[PDB]
């Protein structure tokens, strides 16, 4: 037997290894391919269970270029290097997020 080591988690994909630029890219084009609007959020670690994270700028409505989203992630992380950074994708049909995951765990 092997003992289960316990640690904080951060919802979808957090039970998998952190994502390289390649894996992040594929999630973003998945969202764009779904018609969802990419969005970026950040918050202090201790506050990650908050319903309302700081919004980085505005959602990227009509955004087709993955790379522009990937750069805005970098810029958000560079502005707040101690914060967790989240990617979300808005689904205006369902008034929900199609997808959301923590890009950097801070």
């Amino acid at each position: 037997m092997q003992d289960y080591k316990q640690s904080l988690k951060y919802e979808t994909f957090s039970y998998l290894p952190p994502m390289n630029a390649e894996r992040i890219r594929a999630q973003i084009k998945y969202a764009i391919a779904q018609g969802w609007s990419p969005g970026i959020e950040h918050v202090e670690v201790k506050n990650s269970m908050n319903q309302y994270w700081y919004m980085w700028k505005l959602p990227f409505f009509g955004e087709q270029n993955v790379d522009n989203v990937l750069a805005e992630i970098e810029a958000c992380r560079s502005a707040y290097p101690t914060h967790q950074v989240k990617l979300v994708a808005y689904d205006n049909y369902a008034q929900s997020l199609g997808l959301a995951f923590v890009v950097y765990r801070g």
Binding site: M1, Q2, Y4, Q6, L8, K9, Y10, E11, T12, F13, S14, Y15, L16, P17, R23, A26, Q27, Y30, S48, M49, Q51, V88, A89, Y93, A94, Q95, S96, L97, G98, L99, A100, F101
Partner: protein
Amino acid sequence: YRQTYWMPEYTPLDSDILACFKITPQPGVDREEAAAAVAAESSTGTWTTVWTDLLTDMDYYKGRAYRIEDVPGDDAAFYAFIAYPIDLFEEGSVVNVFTSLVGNVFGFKAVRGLRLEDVRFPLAYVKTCGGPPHGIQVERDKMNKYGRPLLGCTIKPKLGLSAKNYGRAVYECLRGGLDFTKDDENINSQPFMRWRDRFLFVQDATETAEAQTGERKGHYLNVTAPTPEEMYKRAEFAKEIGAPIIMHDYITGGFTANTGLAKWCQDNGVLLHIHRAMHAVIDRNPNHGIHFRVLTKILRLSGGDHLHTGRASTLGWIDLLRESFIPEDRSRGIFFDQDWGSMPGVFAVASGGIHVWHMPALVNIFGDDSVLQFGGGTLGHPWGNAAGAAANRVALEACVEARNQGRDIEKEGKEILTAAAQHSPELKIAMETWKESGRDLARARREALSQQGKA
């Protein structure tokens, strides 16, 4: 029966409730007369026309058979389609609609078998019912959960466990990565585990695993009870202690109780998980009884936030459960257009003897807005409930990350799971343990009606 209750030229009004009965008639009766009998027996049930009828408008206040079809691949049975004016029923009462449709006619001796296949609830009647207390999107927002199906465990053994030991299993599961644990449908308040003690220790477990994971946890506390006063007392204690979700057995507890409980859940912000215990008594026999898709619709109107959904018919009632509009589709047993309007949809719940090796086919058949409930597939892990939960949770995510990447996750099943175990020892050990458009149509039609209206 025929001359008054067979109306082949009647076109259903949009306010009408429609039913589809599969009738297997006795050898010496014609299809016209049997349809008209089922319509009469499920609305006026008149065996002799008397003077009090002449005090009423008999042409309005009656069900009416208006079409008959063959059953493909069955010359002995036929489909009878019946319209009921919206005025025959009490508003906002699945109890009354149910009783009216199925309360008298299944004992009709002149038929060999009777099966209610589908019911068309018109929008104008949908608007009179409370619906899910929350629904998929509200719940996701309340629980702050997006982009993946949710994951649950059903605690076993159903019997013999003290309140505290039961909370221990719950704690081990939740802390390893499941969102939800679940009371069995038989777990109410038995001698070996009184409900008040169960609620206290489960909530303790819920809070401890939530603090240790940073993700919101829940456990469907079963409030199925002998009496409405006991049901509501149990629900109130779950709210009092902070519990986000409760459970009801809506068939065996019954629709009156379930409808009231869903009303109470919306008024109190408690999520409501619905178990379908007893359904196979009603819905297994393809010749006699009520099809599960009817029982699906009744539950959406009556109210629930999750519903256990357990091939083509299966995918059909999931749509009926979750989507805003579902077109007619005989290949998936859907006999009428069903419009739900703004009435929210319900999480579909998959349970029953599933483990990690089912995960690709489950993410692929059910999609995101579903709950994947592992009974023995979580507890049976040779390392405990936490490792079993983590394995299921890793397998779930990797299948979601594969699919978002475009891969044929069901075909490439054993490969996505194998690349995943290379980082989760817990998922690897579990793999040696066990062997081996509905949305888009609904959106396409809302946009169509948004620009053109009637077109």
